[PDB]
Paper text:
Thus 5 potent mAbs use IGVH3-53 (bearing 3–10 non-silent mutations). The flat binding site of the RBD and the approach angle of the Fabs limit their H3 length (11 residues) and the number of contacts H3 makes with the RBD, which is compensated for by the interactions from H1, H2, and all CDRs of the light chain. Thus, H1 and H2 determine the mode of engagement, as seen in previous studies of antibodies with this V-region (Yuan et al., 2020b).
S from both SARS-CoV-2 and SARS-CoV-1 uses angiotensin-converting enzyme 2 (ACE2) as the cell surface receptor (Hoffmann et al., 2020, Li, 2015), ACE2 is expressed in a number of tissues, including epithelial cells of the upper and lower respiratory tracts. S consists of two subunits, S1 that mediates receptor binding and S2 responsible for viral and host cell membrane fusion (Walls et al., 2020; Wrapp et al., 2020). The S1 fragment, at the membrane distal tip of S, includes an N-terminal domain (NTD) and receptor binding domain (RBD). Although both regions are immunogenic, the RBD contains the interacting surface for ACE2 binding (Lan et al., 2020).
Residue numbers in the entry:
A (entry chain L): 1 to 215
B (entry chain H): 1 to 133, 138 to 220
C (entry chain B): 348 to 595
D (entry chain A): 447 to 496
Write the structure that this text describes.
Amino acid sequence: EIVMTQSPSSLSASVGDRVTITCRASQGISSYLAWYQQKPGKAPKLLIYAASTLQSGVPSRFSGSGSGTDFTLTISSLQPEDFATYYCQQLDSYPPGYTFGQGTKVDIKRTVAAPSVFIFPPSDEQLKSGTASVVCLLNNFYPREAKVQWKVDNALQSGNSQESVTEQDSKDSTYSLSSTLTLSKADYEKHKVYACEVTHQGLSSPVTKSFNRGE
Amino acid sequence: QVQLVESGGGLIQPGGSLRLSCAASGVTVSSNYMSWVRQAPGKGLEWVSIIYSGGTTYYADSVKGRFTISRDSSMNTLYLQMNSLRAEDTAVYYCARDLMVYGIDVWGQGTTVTVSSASTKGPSVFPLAPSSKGTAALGCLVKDYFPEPVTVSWNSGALTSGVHTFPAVLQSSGLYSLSSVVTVPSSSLGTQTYICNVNHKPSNTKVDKKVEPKSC
Amino acid sequence: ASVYAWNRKRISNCVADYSVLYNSASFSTFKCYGVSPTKLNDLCFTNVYADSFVIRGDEVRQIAPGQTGKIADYNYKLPDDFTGCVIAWNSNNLDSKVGGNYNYLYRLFRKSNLKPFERDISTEIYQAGSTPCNGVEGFNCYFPLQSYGFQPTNGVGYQPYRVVVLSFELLHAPATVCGPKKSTNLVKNKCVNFNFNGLTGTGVLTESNKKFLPFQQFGRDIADTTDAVRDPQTLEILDITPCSFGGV
Amino acid sequence: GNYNYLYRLFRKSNLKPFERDISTEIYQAGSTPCNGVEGFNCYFPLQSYG
Ligand SMILES: *[C@@H]1O[C@H](CO)[C@@H](O)[C@H](O)[C@H]1NC(C)=O
């Protein structure tokens, strides 16, 4: 089977920047490649076909190049309407199917901002139901990459949490992230110290917010 | 007017059946390679099926023996018949005109398919109280509802600055959860009431939850 | 040839040595439908057809009865009742260039499937939409042929393979293509069961005394019995004396 | 597709009346001895029905 490796997973770019997105075929596919653009909630939009031909109606700042294994998309001067996700597609593959790259999100570049971290205990109302939700908030941060680690009595917790990220804010270009730790009431009452540990480029060292159950 | 318009999507229990339509204008469906491509939430495009102009059809392994592609030349319409539906079939389904080496140039707007055994349920709204320890954060946890969507406002629309309503996540239980947060001056936590307004039309549920500083 | 314009050589009036073909280590695909390869040398047919072209490796599987795909539907179609053999080998060392070999083409657009052994060489602009084309390319108006552009760095699935389809046709007309049907040495003065050109019998072959004409093959006694034969290889006339027998 | 039903595709000679052959010996379709190893011109005599 032929594998498509796309890189990077994300890049940040200001308006006017030259953007470059890379796609690597695990074996030679000659020119059997196409590039697409896709925005949240919309369908894909074809940009380049046959590795290097510009689809009709696509602005000339888009260009594709490469043949064989290594392919690049190029946006010579990034415009505001070009912030989207981009990915490559191997053309006319076998077995039947569409092999797409993993995708490259192109977000708006801005100065680094460290998150504000807040931890929220489960409410008394929810505890009466049988389930304890613990929520960790990462407010107005940039860039998107961020690591959240839950600790329960200093035990690092994985497998019982889910995360949700907003889209880039239309005024200050930051992200916000929430993390929800779900436990049974019985488990929750077996432990005292609940904390989320946040590491981020804006923080010189991991920031921890915690509470003690019942205080 | 070159466009593809999909329809037929909806909510259906596992094992049910569903028939998607794709009405074309400009493009002639029976003269073209026509594909169905789907995209699960947060996942990538997954090819489903294709019908050749000469009549040849192919299907993804995951849908073989359950899905059937077809077309009505007189209606210039493409169809996908989906039987024995499963939870992991949940996705937006696009129809597309394939030009092979010339790429996929015409896409539809997409129709949404949701397959789930979950029972329609209005959400519980729990407070996320500001901690006792210049600006404090508070919010509302909108837990265990189905189906999407819910909308959230603060003080009936009077509080919009600094509000962040996160996209919902799907839990192992098959129900959705979601949080809405806002940051406010610490100095207001005693003199300003904060209520979140939660609306969930599928269950006819409107809930207002007052979020207060917690009393130790 | 390009697959859309596949080449056909009609072979007739000849002896076919199939040992050259099946005993070859140089073929990567060799599938026969309705005939055993080894057991082809003792068969006669009225016509042999040799169709040849180049396709992708991923497309080789389409050269078979009852297959689908761009090649089987729009380029080269075998019948469901195919009696013949499909032979294919990788030719990346020959049919690919470093810039890409664009000489080999395939049909990409066609309204309906080819009938078996049909050959469409038309270049009419393909009308993919509602408004007609009138020989003008453009949106919804596509040149029907496309190029493979074989590059030597391609994976096997995209590398060129040469394909030869041998069809064996048998009509109500005299057969002109048979297999070798070799012979052996002959022994004299010993009772043998013999089979000359068209006749068979049992007897002892001996050096003769007759003078057959240059065109005479089989002798005949007065009572319509074979008496002498002309050896097909050696221009010598052999008398057939039936092997000794008698009552006990 | 049920493939539990098999049929023999090759044999060095035709079966005699009421003869039963269940051997799984590799049929040598070419001039190269198989030595019990399947491959080119070395086939498993049985094939499954579709
Ligand atoms: C047939 O071939 C043999 C050798 O293979 C040769 O000696 C003989 O003269 C040939 N006969 C004729 C009629 O050409």
